[PDB]
Amino acid sequence: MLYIDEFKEAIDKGYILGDTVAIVRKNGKIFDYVLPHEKVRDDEVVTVERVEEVMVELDKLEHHHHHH
């Protein structure tokens, strides 16, 4: 699974430019981003997604515990 830190860094460093991005999902979960010209295998499903929507989906894997 892809996590938010890597995704945000790829945006900050200019690998993921713009408002939509190619994504591969497995079982509905995001497993990687795919950059222009990168190759995928036949069993991979590549969709174009909103960068903001990806950021919400990746938040589902973050820790939110806020009691101490």
Numbering used by the authors: 1 to 68
Task: Give excerpts from the publication.
Work describing the contribution of bacteriophages to the emergence and diversification of the M1T1 GAS clone revealed that each prophage contains a conserved open reading frame (ORF) of ~60aa named paratox (prx). prx is always located adjacent to a toxin within the prophage, and GAS prophages that lack a toxin also lack prx. In our efforts to study the regulation of natural competence in Streptococcus spp. by ComRS based quorum sensing, we discovered that prx genes contain a perfect CIN-box within their promoter region for recognition by the SigX core-RNA-polymerase complex, and that transcription of prx is induced by XIP. Additionally, we found that Prx binds ComR directly and inhibits activation by XIP both in vitro and in vivo. Taken together we conclude that the conserved prophage protein paratox acts as an inhibitor of new DNA acquisition by pyogenic, bovis and suis streptococci.
Additionally, an X-ray crystal structure of Prx reveals a novel protein fold with only distant structural homologues, which suggests a unique molecular mechanism of ComR-XIP inhibition. Prx crystallized as a dimer in the asymmetric unit. The dimer interface consists of residues from β-strands β1, β3 and the loop region between β2 and β3, which allows the N and C terminal α-helices to be positioned on the same face of the complex. As calculated by MOLEonline/2.531, the pore or cavity sizes are 380Å3 and 993Å3. Although analysis by SEC indicates a possible dimer, analysis with PISA32 gives a complex significance score of 0.1, which suggests a high probability that dimerization is a crystal packing artifact. As demonstrated by analytical ultracentrifugation (AUC), Prx is a monomer (8.39 kDa) in the buffer conditions used in our biochemical experiments. A surface composed of one face of α1 (D5, L8, and E9) and α2 (M55, V46) also cluster into a conserved patch, and both surfaces tend toward an electronegative electrostatic potential. The observed Prx dimer appears superficially similar to a Bateman fold, with each Prx monomer as the individual CBS (cystathionine β-synthase) domain37 as shown in an alignment with human AMP-activated kinase.
